[PDB]
Subunit: 146 residues, 4 copies
């Protein structure tokens, strides 16, 4: 019933994407700030269901971009071997801070709510390319802060 | 219960207006941007229930206007013959973009929500001259984007 | 459950105040624009249950003020006779427009929603000095427009 | 269901914190305006369940700060004696006004709503370090006013 979520940042309980075993995986990450590639070494990490690192994708080339960015993963590990099918957790680190010596973080399944869609007549959140049910949302806050 | 829709753009499942067979049809279209008549050839299209083009109304003369604009249709096709009574879908194209070579679009049954009215005590959306039930709404987003 | 009404203008179905027969009546009116007393002759009208004019209070002296303003009525008609007890409708006209030759209007029971109060645990709207139940609200819109 | 509370000031029915009898008490207060220590003498008051003053903490040193500030209380009264365990009400006064000759006030259990958290799937308000249920909220309004 409420569309007050629109324009908020939503954190959802969807943190992984499915790799079928052969086909590429398109996925989207939301960056709250423009990526600055001089601030540490920004990168995406792809982890398996046991939180073991399977793949790292450098974010260097995305210097200057913010908001939702679309990526692809060929489903290979760091050697180039295609990994077992299943759910992979995708996260990212970017913009290392001088003082805290820590990176900003993001991950699949969070970002600005761009629209609310009513699906007969169930509410869905549009977040970049993802469309997610309301009850998957665990937290909301305003952009730029918190 | 919620009035968070106010100020949002709403897309509703109302896409047509009724022509009775003789009387003029007043209708309203929402333009997200000022119409610029130097950008392609802007026009309203009126289609019948089989999505067959019945009438075209040039938007040339509305250069400079934005928001809700009221129009009238005499119920004639392009020859001047009065068409069969029934539901007609009304859409529009305007502001052809140089790069994409595509026009912006709009249609009956979408636009800024100007107020929420409680009808004993059922919520209605006021959208220009139209007043529509909440459950007719299929999507909401913020103006200027998406 | 929703506090999205806060900051909206609410129209409610409360349009009158009770006069007991002897005691003064405090009441509040919301002015959407600063009163300009050079623009026609601004005034409050007090009507009885049959919409018969009982009292007129000039708004001249409130030149420059906007928002919620508090007034008092001694319960007398234009002669100075105390009127029958009961419900009196209170309205106002101000800022005559040159073009339309019409005044802006306001009345008891509409205005900006300044806060939402939960009354164990029923939602109330705070509107100036008035505190009104949610279900008394018949319409909401954003200030400055509509 | 609604996240319209985010960015509002909430007043809740939580006005006290628990002192166990030995361990320090961390607590947070929300200041709507920057503290100005030249404006009267700003201070926190800690009261017991009978509204008897147990401790005063000077706010002098927090000159210039606003929003949520974290404090600690060792659980001693003004002599330095550890007080009985139980619930203590914590309030504050700051920024004495020249005209009204009154201080602004604040207290535990009110402040800006920084996020809404869904706790399986019960809504919680994040207010500084405190996380409180929706039904503890008795009033909402916009920051800077009311």
């Amino acid at each position: 019933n409420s569309v007050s979520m629109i324009g908020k940042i939503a954190e959802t309980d969807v943190s992984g994407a499915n790799f079928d075993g052969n086909n590429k995986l398109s996925f989207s990450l939301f960056f709250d700030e423009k990526i600055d590639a001089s601030k540490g070494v920004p990168a995406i990490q792809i982890l398996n269901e046991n939180n073991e690192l399977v793949k790292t994708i450098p974010l260097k080339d995305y210097n200057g971009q913010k908001g939702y960015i679309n990526f692809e993963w060929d489903g290979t590990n760091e050697k180039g071997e295609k990994v077992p099918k299943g759910n992979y957790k995708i996260k990212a680190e970017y913009n290392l801070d001088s003082h805290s010596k820590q990176y900003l973080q993001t991950r699949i399944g969070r970002g600005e709510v761009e629209s609310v869609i009513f699906d007969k007549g169930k509410p869905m959140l549009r977040m970049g390319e993802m469309v997610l049910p309301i009850d998957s949302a665990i937290e909301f806050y305003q952009p730029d802060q918190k």
